[PDB]
């Protein structure tokens with residue numbers, strides 16, 4: 286019973302978080318085997334960030350300028366390099382708490398957990414999604430850069446996000462663990478604006494299935510629709526177009542509940558056109574789009590990790 | 592920037608979770624030093640739960656009937672006793688991952704993190720509150736009993752909740768770690784209904800302060816009010832009466848923002864009487880009441896743990 290925004294257990298990632306200080310900046314790094322990964326803007330002053338030439342700034346840095354601390358103990362840096370927008374600091378000790386892991390570049394609409402950290406110490410954990418405009422709506426303050434996002438599968442941590450920037454609109458931008466930004470964003474203090482923050486239709490529908498599983502049923506109607514008919518309504522409300530691939534992904538939830546996907550689309554259609562009339566669904570007064578189909582099955586299933 | 596429902600890092604608690612099986616029931620236990628704590632209904636069959644006599648059922652149990660597993664290794668049970676609604680299983684090995692900890696019985700309105708587990712393995716983490724009717728709105732399936740709720744302060748885990756029951760209405764009931772239920776609930780499969788699920792007024796006001804800190808300002812008005820005037824409106828909307836003690840707790844957020852608490856009460860009053868007119872606050876279309884004042888300061892502050 287019940288449905289909550291649920292993050293993955295964070296312990297496997299907590300054991301990888303370190304502090305990285307270069308000259309005057311301190312942020313977080315990720316220690317996996319004998320490499321510490323962090324944002325390359327650790328090498329910049331606040332002034333540098335208006336027009337940084339990272340290769341030039343890096344030339345004035347040596348291994349011993351990167352002060353890396355795992356809890357109370359210092360790590361010895363024996364090499365460094367820049368890969369896209371991250372630095373890889375080779376250290377002389379493999380992290381003994383390195384979990385089984387992979388680096389993944391996620392697609393928009395996918396969800397992940399964030400372990401917010403400051404000065405190398407974990408502060409909290411919450412659940413995000415990669416938005417269709419390639420921002421995330423996180424909770425990050427100064428000093429949180431280098432905090433990571435991840436998913437877990439059985440005993441493997443798939444790292445998908447590293448936090449680098451806050452846009453002037455208060456949303457967040459960052460990279461995969463190869464250091465390539467999601468979307469068009471850059472690690473410069475400049476005018477970069479987010480595009481339309483469209484709604485992840487397949488996730489809304491998954492959440493509606495979660496609601497039915499839990500007794501919230503008032504929005505089910507006698508109607509059905511078609512993909513093309515539904516998508517005229519999605520367009521008007523700045524929803525992603527629903528594809529047959531989405532329908533196929535919702536197959537398991539459809540079979541579990543006996544509600545055809547297109548029937549659920551017709552319920553969503555009525556919700557978009559008429560609103561919720563002051564009612565709630567799973568404790569929400571709006572249509573939630575940061576649960577994936579897999580998220581719903583998992584929470585409705587009890588899937589565990591190690 | 593940003594405000595999220597944020598749980599504590601779960602690693603310190605993950606290291607304490609074990610599996611407890613008695614005869615035919617398997618749920619979760621909490622391993623701290625050389626004691627494993629779990630719900631006493633691990634000793635019951637599904638049939639027993641309609642009218643269990645726990646002392647009588649316990650007489651037919653010995654140490655070796657309690658099969659306790661921490662990951663893949665078996666723990667040896669060398670004594671057992673019942674304390675209120677929990678069992679304490681003495682084992683012959685102190686948990687090497689025992690964090691610094693305390694047991695606390697929380698008051699309604701306080702928040703905590705839940706580490707949902709199945710078969711001794713962590714599944715996810717989320718943020719709850721103790722409701723004024725002494726339920727919690729969690730996400731628990733069969734097998735999650737024994738999962739715990741906790742807060743962290745510096746390096747100390749304060750355990751406050753153990754999960755025992757699901758009410759027929761889909762909300763959740765449980766105990767502190769001394770085994771005393773929150774509220775009037777019992778570990779019997781019977782008619783126990785929840786009282787009024789009132790709203791935690793001081794938490795709504797804290798969240799409104801969080802919203803102002805973050806740029807969400809449209810609900811600020813030119814009005815003020817008094818405690819007694821505001822509370823006539825709280826009563827009508829099934830809000831907790833606001834006390835001077837609540838006002839004093841909101842002092843830090845008031846000082847940070849320069850908005851007098853009673854001015855914020857007048858904004859909340861207008862929100863209760865007029866609604867949100869289809870607008871949102873911090874991504875929500877309703878008035879959120881599961882952030883405490885301390886929660887807001889913490890997330891708006893960057894407070895870290897170890």
Ligand SMILES: O=C(NCC(=O)N1CCCCC1)Nc1ccc2nnsc2c1
Pocket residue numbers: 310326327328329330331332334427428451452453454473474475
């Ligand atoms: O350097 C910035 N902040 C200060 C800082 O923590 N460091 C700067 C030195 C390098 C690493 C650490 N840049 C920034 C922040 C928020 C923004 N919101 N809109 S533009 C924008 C730019």
Ligand SMILES: O=C(NCC(=O)N1CCCCC1)Nc1ccc2nnsc2c1
Pocket residue numbers: 616632633634635636637638640733734757758759760779780781
């Ligand atoms: O025993 C129940 N469930 C089955 C079970 O997991 N075990 C029973 C044996 C002892 C431990 C494990 N009781 C219950 C559940 C949900 C309810 N919702 N409303 S009443 C109500 C009663």
Ligand SMILES: [Cl-]
Pocket residue numbers: 568569570571874875876877
């Ligand atoms: Cl909402």
